[PDB]
Design a binder for this molecule. Structure first.
Ligand SMILES: *[C@@H]1O[C@H](CO)[C@@H](O)[C@H](O)[C@H]1NC(C)=O
Length: 388
């Protein structure tokens, strides 16, 4: 019954997006005059105004919608549930002229991989939890997470969220950091700033940290806070590209194949932050950047740990709580990075964005993270729309 291949074989008549936007006809005005620069697969049939997946979009079928030239949304199909959790060789997916620079060299930290030095806990990521001792969260080493980004409210100045650097110019965070009506949150570009290269939360880091304005915010078109933070994803463009350093460097983004390889080889991923998730919940506390390694949870155990429906776009991490052992629920910075290291190409990849399940009033077992592995075609279409 379920729709396979992310809807690439689909031949039905669904012609509205998840958010009620009527699809435009594939042959239409700005669907033929400003929508042919993109390379489509001819085996897919672009019929009338029906949702289709002609570009191998891991997210699924989509269609053009009214708005600016190239505007589009995704459609609601019942995709088959997919268990993603099943020199330096890397090749660049995005156009550097719209992505900015940084992709070719992503996930190789100047102070670690580039000097053939291992950070203090990375070997832990590839080791089965022997039961026994756990390596607890501690202060990060200098340069350990040079893709770490802080999102601030401009006025009053206040740390709002974490985020992550994916190029010199683009940053990923959770949509609920920008738009969350339950907490009366509706931030536009001019309400915010970001600081990059930071280690200390409270000390100005002369010659190291960088501040930046945001030029543009793209909330994911599937974002729906109503149904358990569905597609809790946002992409933000820096008004001025940030200069790379020993302290500022982008993380890599994985496709489905790379995600599979990361979860097949690793036992654990890594969460870095200033405990902002725990703090903002209490609003709606470490002064130095923290790092903790957390085991990936088996999907059935994740499904059984919570009341809500856990979709295949979401995963749990943390140690299982016991009579003498608390878990790692609500770890990290809201919208912050959950990363994994590839033992195959030595590079770091973001695997999730810190989210929540029922939230910190009833999440007590594991933390919840939104998968990033489906995002590449979305990011591609967004950056090509924005232009250079
Ligand atoms: C937030 O307010 C903006 C004004 O900047 C307005 O355009 C918009 O309706 C609000 N955003 C949402 C998602 O409601």
């Amino acid at each position: 019954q379920c729709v396979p291949d992310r809807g690439q074989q689909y031949q039905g008549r669904l012609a509205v997006t998840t958010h009620g936007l009527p699809c435009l006809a594939w042959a239409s005005a700005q669907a033929k005059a400003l929508s042919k620069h993109q390379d489509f697969n001819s085996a897919v049939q672009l019929v009338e105004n029906f949702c289709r997946n002609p570009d191998g979009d891991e997210e699924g079928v989509w269609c053009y919608v009214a708005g600016k030239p190239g505007d589009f949304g995704y459609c609601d199909l019942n995709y088959c549930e997919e268990a993603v959790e099943e020199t330096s060789e890397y090749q660049t997916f995005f156009n550097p002229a719209t992505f900015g620079s940084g992709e070719a060299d992503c996930g190789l930290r100047p102070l670690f991989e580039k000097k053939s030095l291992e950070d203090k806990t990375e070997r832990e990521l590839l080791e089965s939890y022997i039961d026994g001792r756990i390596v607890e969260g501690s202060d990060a080493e200098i340069g350990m997470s040079p893709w770490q980004v802080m999102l601030f409210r401009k006025s009053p100045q206040e740390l709002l969220c974490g985020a992550s650097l994916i190029s010199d110019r683009w940053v990923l965070t959770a949509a609920h950091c920008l738009l969350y009506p339950p907490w009366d949150k509706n931030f536009t570009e001019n309400d915010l700033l970001v600081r990059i290269g930071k280690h200390s939360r409270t000390r100005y880091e002369r010659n190291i940290e960088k501040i930046s304005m945001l030029e543009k915010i793209y909330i994911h078109p599937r974002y729906n806070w109503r149904e358990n933070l569905d597609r809790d994803i946002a992409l933000m463009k820096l008004k001025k590209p940030v200069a790379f350093s020993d302290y500022i460097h982008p993380v890599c983004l994985p496709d489905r194949e790379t995600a599979a390889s990361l979860l097949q080889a690793g036992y654990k991923g890594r969460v870095t932050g200033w405990g902002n998730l725990k703090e903002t919940w209490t609003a709606n506390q470490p002064s130095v950047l923290q790092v903790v390694n957390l085991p990936i949870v088996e999907r059935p155990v994740c499904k059984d740990s919570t009341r809500i429906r856990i979709t295949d776009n979401m995963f749990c991490a943390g140690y299982k709580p016991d009579e003498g052992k608390r878990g790692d629920a609500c770890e990290g910075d809201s919208g912050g990075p959950f990363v994994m290291k590839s033992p195959f190409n030595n590079r770091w990849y973001q695997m999730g964005i810190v989210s929540w399940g029922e939230g910190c009033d009833r999440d007590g077992k594991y933390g919840f993270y939104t998968h990033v592995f489906r995002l590449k075609k979305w990011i591609q279409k967004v950056i090509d729309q924005f232009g250079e």
